[PDB]
Design a protein around this ligand. Structure first.
Ligand SMILES: CCCCCCCCCCCCCCCCCC(=O)OC[C@H](COP(=O)([O-])OCC(O)COP(=O)([O-])OC[C@@H](COC(=O)CCCCCCCCCCCCCCCCC)OC(=O)CCCCCCCCCCCCCCCCC)OC(=O)CCCCCCCCCCCCCCCCC
Ligand SMILES: CCCCCCCCCCCCCCCCCC(=O)OC[C@H](COP(=O)([O-])OCC(O)COP(=O)([O-])OC[C@@H](COC(=O)CCCCCCCCCCCCCCCCC)OC(=O)CCCCCCCCCCCCCCCCC)OC(=O)CCCCCCCCCCCCCCCCC
Ligand SMILES: CCCCCCCCCCCCCCCCCC(=O)OC[C@H](COP(=O)([O-])OCC(O)COP(=O)([O-])OC[C@@H](COC(=O)CCCCCCCCCCCCCCCCC)OC(=O)CCCCCCCCCCCCCCCCC)OC(=O)CCCCCCCCCCCCCCCCC
Ligand SMILES: CCCCCCCCCCCCCCCCCC(=O)O[C@@H](COC(=O)CCCCCCCCCCCCCCC)COP(=O)(O)OCC[N+](C)(C)C
Ligand SMILES: CCCCCCCCCCCCCCCCCC(=O)O[C@@H](COC(=O)CCCCCCCCCCCCCCC)COP(=O)(O)OCC[N+](C)(C)C
Ligand SMILES: CCCCCCCCCCCCCCCCCC(=O)O[C@@H](COC(=O)CCCCCCCCCCCCCCC)COP(=O)(O)OCC[N+](C)(C)C
Ligand SMILES: CCCCCCCCCCCCCCCCCCCC(=O)O[C@H](COC(=O)CCCCCCCCCCCCCC)COP(=O)(O)OCCN
Lengths: 71, 104, 375, 80, 111, 82, 145, 205
C-alpha cells in the first residue's frame, strides 16, 4: 500500500521509495543486477524496518556493562 | 531486558499455535464437518490478526484491508459451507449413521 | 475519474442485466437467450489485450451451454474474478480474485445438482471447500509473515508460487479436482478445468512467479499418466489427463514460454469441449484424438508448442519423462476409443444441444493448417 | 501472409456444412442455405486471421528492432 | 515524533485508478467533464453508436422472440449496448482532450 | 466349444481371496487433508534443500517408487490386531 | 503488561479447548470466548473499530449461524472419550514443534483512525470495497437458493 | 544428396578451422552458476563425507514412504471401538524399518560410487553401474529367482539414465542458440542480435 495509519505515509515508506528510485536510475538489463547495484539502499530500508544493527549494538553494550559490573 | 521483545516472542508463539490448532486440530482429533469449518475460521482469524499486527508494526493500512477482506471472504465461505452441510444432512439415507463425520 | 469509468461500466452492466432478469422471470422463457446475449455484450467491455480476448471467447462459449439466468450470472461472476486475477499486483488482488472464483465454483456446483445427486455432489463440494480453506489459510499466513518481514506486498515470492500451484492443480494439489469434478455436472467440470487456468498462467507469466524446481511438473506428469492408465472410470481418465498436461505446461511456463501456454490453453479448451459434452461418438472420438495429440487435429499443434518449448530448455530428464508419460497417456486415450467403438453397442442420450460443439470439432480439424506457423 | 487463405477458408466452410449434415445423419446436400453461410463466414474468418497474423508479425519486427536486432532491409521485407 | 494535525473536512483523497503517463499531445482540458467529452465525440463514432444500436435491437428481438418477450429484450439490449459504446467513445474523447492520445482534429475544432 | 485359458486356482478359493477387499472403506478426505497440509509445508521446505546430484535424485526416485505401497494393498491386508 | 501477556497466553488455551472438547455446541462456546480474547488482543495493539468488527461479524452473526446449523443437524457424539494421555502429549508436541523458533518482532502499538480508513476505503482503495460487495452478493445468491 | 550415385551427407575438413564468432555483441546470462553447496555435496573425495552428505535424501524418501503406509494403517483402525493394542507400537516399526532400509540402500549406493571413483580415479559410467548393481544385489538377498537378475539391472540402469540425461545431454547441446544464426553456419545472412534474448530473470525460489 504505502499509506500511513493516522495520515501521511508508512513509517519506512521513504526508505523504500529511495531504493525504488535507485533501481529506476540503474541501467542494468535485469532486475537481479539492479537489485545488486541498489543493495545498500535495501539494507537501509531493512535497517529502518527492524533496527537490527541498533539492537545488536545495545546487546553488546549491555553485555559489556554486565561484565564490568560483575568484575 | 526488553518487554517488547518478550511480548513479540509471546505473540508469535501464541499466534502460530492458534493457527496450527485451527488448521490441524479438527482433523487430528476426528470431528464433524461443523467443527472443521469452525477451526478453519479460527485459522483465518489468526492470519487476519497477524496482518493487523503487521499493520501496527509498519504503520501501514495494507494489513487492515487484507484483514477486512479475510473477514468478508471467510464469512461467505462459512455460510456456503454450512448450506452445503445442511443439504448433505437432509439427503442422508437411513443406513448412514455418522454422515457428518467423514473422518471416522 | 475517466480511468475508473472503464471498470465501473462492467458493474453497471451486470447490475442492470441482473435486475432485468429478475423482473422478467417467467416460465415462458426459462432459457433466457436474450440475457445470455446481453451478458456476452457486457463482457466485451473488459477486453483490453489478446489474453483478455481469449478470456472473453472462453467465457462466452461456456455461457452458451448454461441454462437459466442464475447459472449465467454466476459465470459472469467467474469471468469478473478471472479478469481481476490477471490484473492482480499484490497478495490482496490474488487472494480476493481467487477466493471469489472459489465461491462461484461452489455455487455453480451446488445449483447444477439434482435431488438424487445431492449426496455425492454436496460431499465433493464440501471436500473441495475444506481443501481450499487449507490452501487459502496457509497462503494468507505466509503472506502475513512476508509482509511483516519485508514491509511490502510483492507478488514475486514462494508463497504465491505454491498457492498458484494449488490453483493449477499440479504436484500433490490435484486431488480436489478429482473429487469435485467427478461428482459435478459435465459442463461445470469442463468450464472450471480450462477457464481458470488462463488467469493463473497470465499471473505467473506477467509477475515473474517462477521457480527453479522442476520436481512438481515432473511429478504431475508421471502421477497423472500412471493414474490415467490405472483408472477404470472415464471421468478419472479425463481428469488425470489435465493433471499430466498442466504439469508439463507448468514446467514450460516457468522458463518464460508465455505465448505457448496461451495457445495451448485455447487448443485444450476446444479439444475438451467435444469429449465432455458427449452426444455423438464421432465428435467424442475427434476430441479424444485432439487431447491425445494426433497430427491431423488442432490438438497436435497445442502439444507441439509445449514439446518444442521443452527442447529449447535442453533438460534431458524432462524430455525422457515426457516421452514415456505421453505413451502411457496414449494407452488411456486408446482405452477411451476402444470403449466407444470396439467394446459393446453404445447408446447415449439424445441431448441435442450442441451449441459450439460442431464449431469446436470443425475448428479442431480445420485449424491445424492456419496455425502451422506457430510450430 | 498466406496466399491461399481465401481458398482454404471456402473449402473449410464446405467442410463445416457437409460435416454438420453428416453428424446429424442427414446427407451432405441437405440444408443448402447452411452451405453458403458457412463458406462465406469461413472465407472471411480465414482472411481476417491472416491479417491478424501479419499485424502481430509487424509488431514483433518493431519490437525486435527496438531491442537491438540489426534487421536488414531484406529482413524488413520478409514481414510485409 | 508528533502527530501531524489533520483537517477532517479536507483530508487528502485520490481516485483508485491512475494512468501513469505524461501527456504527449497538448492538453485542451486538464480535467474534462462528462459533457465536455461527449461534445467532442467524433461523427464517425456516433455513426458506430447508431449502427451498434440498430444491430443490437435486431439481435435482441430475435433472441427475445424465442422467449415470447421480443420487444422488451430489443429495447433493453439496444439501451445497454448504446450506453456501453457511448461510455467507450467518451473515454476515448476525454483521453484525447487530456493529451494522452492524438488530438489534431480536437484542437482545431475548439481552438 | 472353444479353447480357453486355464485359470489357476479353485473357484471358491479365488472368490474368497477377492472377498477380502470387501471391508469398511475410509473416506479419501482424511488422507487428502494430511497430504495437502504436509505437501504445502514440504514445498516451502524444498526451496531450502541443498542441491543434489542428478544421480542421487534419480536413485531416490527409484527407492521411493519401489517402497511406495498402493492403497489397495494395505486395504486388502489390513488386520485390526497387535 | 501482565494483562497483555495473559491475553496472549490465554488465546492458546482457548484454541486448544475447541479441538479437545467432544461436543460441537461446547466448541462453539469456546470459539466465542476465543473471539472475545482476540478482540482484547486487538485492543492492546491500538485498534478499536477493527476489534469491534471481529466481534460483530464473528460473535454477533457467524456464531448464531453455527448454532442454528448445530441444532438442526444434532447428532449423538457422546459415544466414547478417547483423550488418552498419549494422544494429548503428541498433540502438544506437534504444536510446540510448529510454533517454535520463528522470527519474532518487538510488540508495536499503533493508533488507528476511522477518518483515514474510511477515506482510503472509499477513494484510493474503492476497488477492494466493491469486489468485496460483489463477493457478498455471490454468497447471498448462492446460499439463498 | 537425394541421389543414388554418391554418398549422402558431406565431409568437413579437419585441417581447416573456423575462428569462433560471438553469438551477440553483448552476452547477458540469466543462468546462475552452481552453488558452493552443490559442489560440496558433489565432492566424492572422502567416501564417508560424501555418503553422509547425500543420505538425507534417501532418509527423507524412506520417511515419506513409511508415513504413507503408517497413515494407511492408522486411517483404517476404528476410533469408536477401543483397541487393546497400542497403535503407536504397531505403527512405529513400519516407519522405522522403511526409513532404515531406504537409508541403508542409499548408503550402499553412495559408498560404492565414491569408492569405485576413487580407486579407478576417473568419473565414468561404470562407477554408477557398479553402485547400482551392488544396491540391487543387496535388495534381492533373499528374493526368488528372477529378482536377483532384474534388480541389479534396474538399479545399475538408473545411474546410466541419470548420467546420460542429466550431465551428458546439457553439455552436449550447450552451443545451440535458436536465435540469430545457426551455431555452425555463421556465413549465412540471418539477422544478427546486439544482445541475447532474456526470456526470464534468474530464479530465486
Ligand atoms: C481489426 C484489427 C484486428 C487486427 C489486430 C487486432 C488488434 C486491434 C484490436 C481491434 C479489435 C479486433 C479484435 C481482434 C483482436 C482482439 C484484440 C483486442 O481487441 O484488443 C487488442 C488491442 C491492443 O492490444 P494488442 O494489440 O494485443 O497489443 C498489446 C500488447 O502488444 C500486448 O498484447 P499481446 O498479448 O498481443 O503481446 C504480443 C504477444 C503476441 O500475441 C499474438 O501474436 C496474438 C496472436 C493472435 C491470435 C488471435 C487469436 C486470439 C483469440 C481471440 C479472438 C478475438 C476475439 C475478439 C474479442 C474482442 C472483440 C472486439 O506476445 C506474447 O507472447 C503474448 C502472448 C499472446 C497470446 C498468445 C497468442 C495465442 C492465442 C491463442 C491462439 C491459439 C489458437 C487457437 C485457435 C486458433 C484457430 C485458428 O486493444 C484494443 O485495441 C482496444 C480493445 C477494444 C475491444 C473492445 C472495445 C470496443 C467496444 C467497446 C464497448 C463494448 C461494449 C459494446 C459491444 C459492441 C458490440 C455489441
Ligand atoms: C478456415 C480457417 C479457419 C480460420 C478462421 C475460421 C473462421 C471462424 C469462424 C467461421 C465460422 C464458420 C462456421 C460457422 C458457420 C455458421 C453456421 C451456419 O452456417 O448457419 C447456421 C444456420 C443453421 O441453420 P439450420 O441448420 O437450418 O437451423 C436453424 C433452424 O432453422 C432454427 O430456426 P430459427 O428460428 O432460428 O430461424 C432463424 C434463422 C434460421 O432460419 C433458417 O435457416 C431457415 C432457412 C432460411 C431461408 C433460406 C435461405 C434463403 C437463401 C439461402 C441461399 C441458399 C442457396 C442454395 C439454393 C439456391 C436457391 C436459389 O433465419 C435466418 O436465416 C436468419 C438470416 C436471415 C436470412 C434469411 C433469408 C433471407 C432472404 C434471402 C436473403 C438474400 C436472398 C438472395 C438469394 C436467395 C436465393 C439464393 O444457418 C442459417 O441460419 C442461415 C443464415 C442465413 C441464411 C442464408 C442467407 C444467405 C444469403 C442468400 C445467398 C446470397 C449469397 C450470400 C452472400 C450475400 C449475403 C446476402
Ligand atoms: C501422513 C500422510 C501420509 C502421506 C505421507 C506424506 C504426505 C505427502 C507430503 C508431501 C507430498 C509431496 C511429495 C510426495 C510424492 C508426490 C506424490 C503426491 O504427493 O501425490 C499425491 C498422492 C496421492 O495422490 P492421488 O492422485 O490421490 O493418487 C494417485 C495414485 O493413483 C494413487 O493410487 P495408487 O496408490 O493405488 O497407485 C499407485 C501408482 C501411482 O503411480 C505413481 O506413483 C507415479 C509416480 C511415479 C514417479 C513419480 C515422479 C518421479 C519424479 C520424482 C521427482 C524427484 C526426483 C527428480 C528426478 C527423478 C526423475 C524421475 O503407482 C503404483 O502403481 C505403485 C508403483 C509405484 C511407482 C510406480 C513406478 C515403478 C517404477 C520402478 C521400476 C521398478 C520395477 C522394475 C520391475 C518391474 C517388472 C516388470 O499422495 C501420495 O502418494 C504421497 C505419499 C508419499 C509417498 C511417496 C514416496 C516417495 C516420495 C518421493 C519419491 C518420488 C516418486 C513418487 C512415488 C510415489 C508417489 C505417489
Ligand atoms: C479467427 C477466428 C478463429 C479463432 C477462434 C476464436 C474466435 C471465434 C470466432 C468465431 C466464434 C464462433 C463461435 C461459434 C458458436 C456457435 C453458435 C452457437 O453456439 O449458437 C448457439 C447459441 O445458443 C444460445 O444459448 C444463444 C444465446 C446467445 C446467442 C448469441 C449471443 C450473441 C451476443 C452477441 C455476440 C456478438 C459479439 C459481440 C461483439 C464481438 C445455438 O446452439 P443451441 O440452440 O443451444 O443448440 C444447437 C442444437 N443443434 C445444433 C443440435 C441443432
Ligand atoms: C429487410 C429490412 C427490414 C426488415 C424488417 C425488420 C424491421 C423491424 C425492426 C427490427 C425488428 C427485429 C427484426 C426481425 C429479426 C428477428 C425477429 C424475429 O425473431 O422473427 C420472428 C420469429 O423468429 C423468426 O422467425 C426468425 C427470423 C430470423 C430473421 C429473419 C428476418 C430476416 C430480416 C429481418 C431483419 C433484417 C434487418 C432488420 C433491420 C436492420 C419474431 O416472432 P414474434 O415475436 O412473434 O413477432 C411476430 C409478430 N407477430 C407474430 C405478432 C405478427
Ligand atoms: C470491475 C470493477 C470493479 C471495481 C471497480 C473499482 C473502480 C470503480 C470505482 C469508482 C466507483 C464509482 C465512483 C464514481 C466513478 C467516477 C468518478 C465520478 O464520476 O464522480 C465525479 C463527480 O463529478 C460529477 O460529474 C458529478 C455528477 C456525477 C453523477 C453520476 C456520475 C457517477 C455515477 C456513478 C454510478 C453510481 C450511481 C448508482 C449506481 C447504479 C468525479 O468526482 P470529482 O471530480 O471529485 O467531483 C466533481 C468536482 N470537480 C469536478 C469540480 C472537480
Ligand atoms: C535407454 C538407454 C537405457 C539403456 C538400455 C540398455 C538395456 C537395459 C538393461 C539394463 C543394463 C544397465 C544399463 C547398461 C546400458 C549401458 C551399456 C553398457 C555399455 C558399457 O558398459 O560401457 C559403458 C558406457 O556405456 C554407457 O553407459 C552409455 C551407453 C548408453 C546406453 C545405451 C544407449 C542406447 C540404448 C537404447 C536401446 C533401445 C532403447 C530401449 C530401452 C562404460 O563407459 P565408461 O566411460 O565407464 O568406460 C569405462 C572406463 N572406466
Amino acid at each position: 500500500s504505502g499509506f500511513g495509519l493516522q495520515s501521511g505515509t508508512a513509517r519506512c515508506y521513504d526508505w523504500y521509495m529511495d531504493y525504488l528510485k535507485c533501481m529506476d536510475e540503474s541501467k542494468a538489463p535485469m532486475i537481479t543486477l539492479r537489485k545488486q547495484e541498489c543493495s545498500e539502499w535495501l539494507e537501509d530500508y531493512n535497517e529502518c524496518l527492524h533496527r537490527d544493527k541498533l539492537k545488536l549494538r545495545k546487546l553488546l553494550i549491555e553485555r559489556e556493562k554486565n561484565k564490568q559490573e560483575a568484575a | 531486558h526488553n518487554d517488547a521483545e518478550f511480548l513479540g516472542a509471546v505473540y508469535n508463539f501464541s499466534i502460530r499455535s492458534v493457527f496450527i490448532t485451527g488448521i490441524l486440530g479438527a482433523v487430528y482429533w476426528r470431528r464433524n464437518l461443523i467443527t472443521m469449518l469452525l477451526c478453519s475460521e479460527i485459522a483465518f482469524i489468526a492470519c487476519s490478526v497477524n496482518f493487523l499486527y503487521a499493520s501496527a508494526y509498519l504503520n501501514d493500512m495494507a494489513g487492515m484491508l487484507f484483514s477486512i477482506t479475510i473477514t468478508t471472504i471467510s464469512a461467505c465461505e462459512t455460510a456456503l459451507g454450512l448450506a452445503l452441510c445442511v443439504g448433505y444432512f437432509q439427503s442422508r439415507a437411513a443406513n448412514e449413521v455418522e454422515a457428518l463425520n467423514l473422518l471416522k | 475519474m475517466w480511468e475508473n469509468l472503464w471498470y465501473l461500466d462492467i458493474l453497471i452492466n451486470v447490475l442492470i442485466i441482473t435486475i432485468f432478469g429478475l423482473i422478467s422471470c417467467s416460465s415462458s422463457a426459462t432459457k433466457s437467450y436474450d440475457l445470455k446475449g446481453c451478458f456476452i455484450i457486457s463482457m466485451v467491455g473488459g477486453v483490453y489485450d489478446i489474453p483478455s480476448a481469449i478470456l472473453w471467447c472462453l467465457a462466452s462459449l461456456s455461457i452458451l451451454n448454461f441454462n437459466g439466468f442464475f447459472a449465467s450470472l454466476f459465470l459472469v461472476f467467474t469471468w469478473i474474478s478471472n479478469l481481476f486475477a490477471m490484473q492482480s499486483l499484490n497478495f490482496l488482488g490474488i487472494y480476493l480474485a481467487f477466493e471469489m472464483q472459489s465461491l462461484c465454483l461452489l455455487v455453480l456446483g451446488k445449483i447444477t445438482a439434482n435431488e438424487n445427486q445431492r449426496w455425492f455432489a454436496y460431499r465433493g463440494l464440501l471436500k473441495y471447500l475444506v481443501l481450499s480453506l487449507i490452501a487459502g489459510s496457509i497462503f494468507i499466513f505466509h503472506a502475513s509473515s512476508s509482509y511483516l518481514q519485508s514491509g511490502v506486498m510483492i507478488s514475486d515470492s514462494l508463497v504465491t508460487y505454491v498457492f498458484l500451484l494449488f490453483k493449477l492443480g499440479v504436484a500433490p494439489f490435484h486431488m480436489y479436482t478429482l473429487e469435485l469434478f467427478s461428482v459435478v455436472s459435465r459442463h461445470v467440470a469442463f468450464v472450471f478445468s480450462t477457464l481458470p487456468k488462463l488467469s493463473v498462467l497470465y499471473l505467473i507469466s506477467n509477475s515473474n512467479i517462477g521457480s527453479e524446481c522442476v520436481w512438481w511438473g515432473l511429478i504431475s506428469l508421471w502421477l497423472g499418466s500412471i493414474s490415467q492408465y490405472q483408472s477404470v472410470f472415464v471421468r478419472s481418465i479425463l481428469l488425470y489427463s489435465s493433471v499430466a498436461e498442466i504439469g508439463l505446461v507448468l514446467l514450460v511456463l516457468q522458463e518464460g514460454f508465455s505465448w505457448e501456454a496461451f495457445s495451448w490453453v485455447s487448443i485444450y479448451f476446444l479439444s475438451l469441449s467435444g469429449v465432455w459434452h458427449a452426444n455423438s461418438k464421432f465428435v467424442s472420438a475427434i476430441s479424444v484424438a485432439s487431447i491425445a495429440g494426433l497430427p491431423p487435429f488442432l490438438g497436435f499443434i497445442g502439444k507441439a508448442q509445449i514439446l518444442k518449448s521443452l527442447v529449447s530448455i535442453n533438460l534431458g530428464i524432462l524430455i525422457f519423462s515426457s516421452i514415456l508419460a505421453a505413451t502411457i497417456s496414449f494407452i488411456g486415450y486408446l482405452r477411451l476409443i476402444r470403449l466407444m467403438y470396439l467394446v459393446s453397442p453404445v447408446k447415449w442420450k439424445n441431448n441435442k444441444d450442441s451449441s459450439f460443439i460442431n464449431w469446436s470439432t470443425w475448428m479442431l480439424t480445420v485449424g491445424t493448417l492456419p496455425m502451422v506457423y506457430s510450430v | 501472409g498466406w496466399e491461399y487463405a481465401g481458398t482454404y477458408g471456402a473449402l473449410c466452410g464446405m467442410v463445416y456444412a457437409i460435416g454438420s449434415n453428416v453428424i446429424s445423419g442427414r446427407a451432405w446436400f441437405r440444408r443448402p442455405w447452411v452451405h453458403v453461410t458457412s463458406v462465406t463466414l469461413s472465407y472471411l474468418g480465414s482472411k481476417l486471421l491472416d491479417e491478424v497474423q501479419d499485424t502481430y508479425y509487424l509488431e514483433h519486427l518493431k519490437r525486435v528492432e527496438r531491442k537491438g536486432l540489426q534487421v536488414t532491409e531484406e529482413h524488413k521485407k520478409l514481414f510485409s | 515524533t508528533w502527530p501531524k494535525p489533520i483537517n477532517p473536512y479536507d483530508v487528502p483523497s485520490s481516485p483508485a485508478y491512475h494512468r501513469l503517463q505524461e501527456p504527449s499531445y497538448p492538453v485542451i482540458d486538464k480535467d474534462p467533464d462528462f459533457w465536455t467529452a461527449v461534445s467532442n465525440v467524433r461523427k464517425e463514432e456516433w455513426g458506430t453508436t447508431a449502427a451498434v444500436a440498430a444491430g443490437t435491437f435486431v439481435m435482441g428481438y430475435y433472441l427475445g422472440a424465442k422467449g415470447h418477450t421480443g420487444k422488451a429484450s430489443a429495447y433493453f439490449t439496444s439501451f445497454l449496448a448504446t450506453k456501453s459504446i457511448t461510455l467507450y467513445h467518451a473515454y476515448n474523447s476525454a483521453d484525447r482532450l487530456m493529451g494522452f492520445k492524438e488530438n489534431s482534429r480536437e484542437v482545431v475544432k475548439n481552438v | 466349444d472353444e479353447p480357453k485359458h486355464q485359470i489357476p486356482g479353485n473357484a471358491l478359493d479365488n472368490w474368497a481371496f477377492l472377498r477380502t477387499y470387501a471391508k469398511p472403506l475410509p473416506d479419501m478426505i482424511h488422507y487428502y487433508y494430511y497430504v495437502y497440509l504436509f505437501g504445502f509445508f514440504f514445498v516451502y521446505k524444498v526451496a531450502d534443500f541443498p542441491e543434489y546430484s542428478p544421480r542421487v535424485l534419480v536413485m531416490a526416485a527409484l527407492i521411493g517408487s519401489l517402497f511406495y505401497v498402493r492403497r489397495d494393498w494395505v486395504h486388502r491386508e489390513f488386520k485390526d490386531s497387535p | 503488561m501482565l494483562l497483555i501477556y495473559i491475553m496472549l497466553s490465554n488465546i492458546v488455551v482457548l484454541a486448544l479447548s475447541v479441538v479437545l472438547t467432544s461436543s460441537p455446541f461446547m466448541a462453539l462456546m469456546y470459539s466465542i470466548l476465543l473471539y472475545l480474547n482476540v478482540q482484547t488482543i486487538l485492543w492492546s495493539l491500538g485498534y478499536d473499530f477493527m476489534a469491534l468488527i471481529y466481534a460483530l461479524v464473528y460473535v454477533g452473526a457467524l456464531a448464531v449461524l453455527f448454532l442454528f446449523v448445530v441444532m438442526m443437524v444434532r447428532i449423538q457424539v457422546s459415544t466414547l472419550s478417547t483423550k488418552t494421555i498419549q494422544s494429548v502429549l503428541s498433540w502438544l508436541a506437534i504444536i510446540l514443534i510448529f510454533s517454535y523458533g520463528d522470527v519474532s518482532f518487538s510488540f508495536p502499538c499503533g493508533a488507528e483512525s476511522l477518518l483515514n480508513f474510511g477515506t482510503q476505503l472509499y477513494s484510493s482503495c474503492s476497488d477492494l470495497t466493491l469486489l468485496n460487495s460483489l463477493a457478498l452478493t455471490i454468497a447471498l445468491f448462492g446460499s439463498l437458493v | 544428396t537425394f541421389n543414388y550415385v554418391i554418398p549422402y551427407g558431406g565431409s568437413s575438413s579437419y585441417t581447416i578451422n573456423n575462428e569462433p564468432v560471438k553469438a551477440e555483441e553483448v552476452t547477458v546470462d540469466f543462468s546462475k552458476e552452481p552453488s558452493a553447496s552443490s559442489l560440496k555435496l558433489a565432492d566424492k573425495s572422502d567416501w564417508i563425507a560424501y555418503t553422509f552428505n547425500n543420505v538425507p535424501l534417501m532418509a527423507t524418501v524412506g520417511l515419506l514412504a513409511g508415513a504413507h503406509e503408517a497413515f494407511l494403517h492408522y486411517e483404517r483402525t476404528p476410533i469408536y471401538g477401543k483397541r487393546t493394542y497400542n497403535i503407536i507400537k504397531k505403527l512405529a516399526p513400519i516407519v522405522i524399518n522403511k526409513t532404515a532400509y531406504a537409508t541403508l540402500l542409499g548408503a550402499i549406493f553412495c559408498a560404492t560410487d565414491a569408492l569405485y571413483e576413487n580407486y579407478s580415479g576417473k568419473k565414468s559410467y561404470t562407477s554408477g553401474m557398479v553402485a547400482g548393481a551392488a544396491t540391487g544385489a543387496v535388495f534381492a538377498i533373499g528374493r526368488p529367482l528372477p529378482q536377483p537378475l532384474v534388480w541389479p539391472l534396474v538399479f545399475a540402469a538408473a545411474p546410466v539414465i541419470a548420467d546420460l540425461f542429466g550431465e551428458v545431454y546439457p553439455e552436449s547441446m550447450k552451443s545451440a542458440r535458436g536465435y540469430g544464426t545457426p551455431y555452425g553456419f555463421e556465413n549465412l545472412d540471418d539477422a544478427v542480435p546486439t544482445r541475447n534474448p532474456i526470456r526470464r530473470n534468474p530464479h530465486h525460489y
